[PDB]
Ligand code: HEM
């Protein structure tokens with residue numbers, strides 16, 4: 001198979017990887033007018049995977065992708081069943097299943113009023129704003145913006161790190177069907193794990209859904225002073241290499257919870273001390289599979305974030321089914337010295353989380369429910385893994401094995417990641433946007 005890179009919305013396969021990103025959530029007021037606008041908007045603004053892999057000199061100043069919710073498709077008279085079990089009812093209806101405290105959800109996510117989302121990526125606020133205004137001007141009264149969420153990469157040497165301080169965007173699956181660099185330890189999967197209607201997709205798709213994908217969008221608020229305070233209060237006293245200062249034990253505890261140091265160094269490779277050079281090297285920072293630690297937790301806890309969401313050899317070998325692409329961006333201001341000192345969040349900050357897969361229930365939702373929320377996953381371990389400390393939602397939020405020298409000790413971890421809303425979207429192919437959606 002040869003993937004038509006010019007026809008696939010770029011954030012799905014390649015990722016915008018821009019310093020700024022805005023999500024404009026909208027409702028359709030006038031289907032006919034919206035469709036008319038779409039036919040001129042799409043060819044001019046919707047960014048393909050082919051554009052994203054081009055030299056920067058060949059790229060526009062901002063990228064735009066576009067997804068629709070179930071109610072958005074219904075509002076546009078697009079009535080064919082896309083074959084996904086969760087997409088039709090929307091994410092609010094699924095939130096309890098994910099483990100969400102529904103009382104923390106906020107409008108306009110508390111229902112299915114949202115019809116779609118424009119995602120705009122740019123390296124600068126000016127261009128982001130201009131392309132946002134271009135949407136407002138092009139579509140006019142045919143849509144109503146019901147929310148806009150804006151994110152930004154963190155400053156300086158924290159660029160690419162999320163708000164707890166950890167380098168993000170290291171490990172992604174690679175799909176066959178196009179020419180790309182594959183790093184050591186990177187999963188290689190058929191394209192239909194990500195793209196609807198391609199090899200590996202087992203869902204029943206309308207023909208027009210070929211080369212689309214489903215986005216699981218999550219708006220997470222993060223409690224950074226609280227996380228920091230918790231790591232200090234529960235600092236690991238020692239590891240194999242020797243005794244730790246409190247600061248060292250706190251840093252180590254954070255790395256044990258994630259499965260990576262803040263630098264990106266995976267603990268399975270660097271189990272006792274950070275290796276920042278390793279973290280920054282894509283030829284090495286993903287080259288592990290837990291095969292050296294299947295039945296003990298010295299090198300990595302069973303319930304660490306990355307291990308829960310991608311179990312690697314904990315599944316007994318390579319498995320295609322549960323991989324997904326991520327294209328998230330942090331939002332909010334840096335955490336001040338006063339905030340960290342108090343141990344109390346004073347400002348709104350977090351992660352605008354984006355995960356793509358052909359089958360919602362096998363990607364995001366499997367990682368969340370079957371794995372992160374499941375105290376007995378990974379399976380067949382000598383010590384109960386417990387609840388994934390970062391995003392596991394089951395209470396009590398108890399996780400074992402964080403202390404490599406006292407692996408039977410359990411940690412009850414306050415929730416530092418608060419879901420504020422989210423939605424399930426379908427991003428069609430570029431041709432489908434104009435030939436089907438706008439028909
Ligand atoms: C605010 C919430 C979250 C934060 C701060 C966070 C942070 C991180 C970090 C620091 C990494 C390591 C970088 C990497 O390996 O690429 C990571 C990896 C990952 N996360 Fe999250 N994450 C969050 C939520 C989620 C959720 C909700 C899911 C899915 C249910 C998820 C799934 C994954 C996956 C699949 C990986 C890559 C694992 C691998 O391939 O080894 N994350 N995350």
Ligand SMILES: *[C@@H]1O[C@H](CO)[C@@H](O)[C@H](O)[C@H]1NC(C)=O
Pocket residue numbers: 237243
């Ligand atoms: C390690 O810490 C313990 C206290 O937990 C202390 O008794 C011991 O002397 C320390 N060892 C070294 C080599 O500093």
Ligand SMILES: [C-]#N
Pocket residue numbers: 168326328353
């Ligand atoms: C995880 N992103």
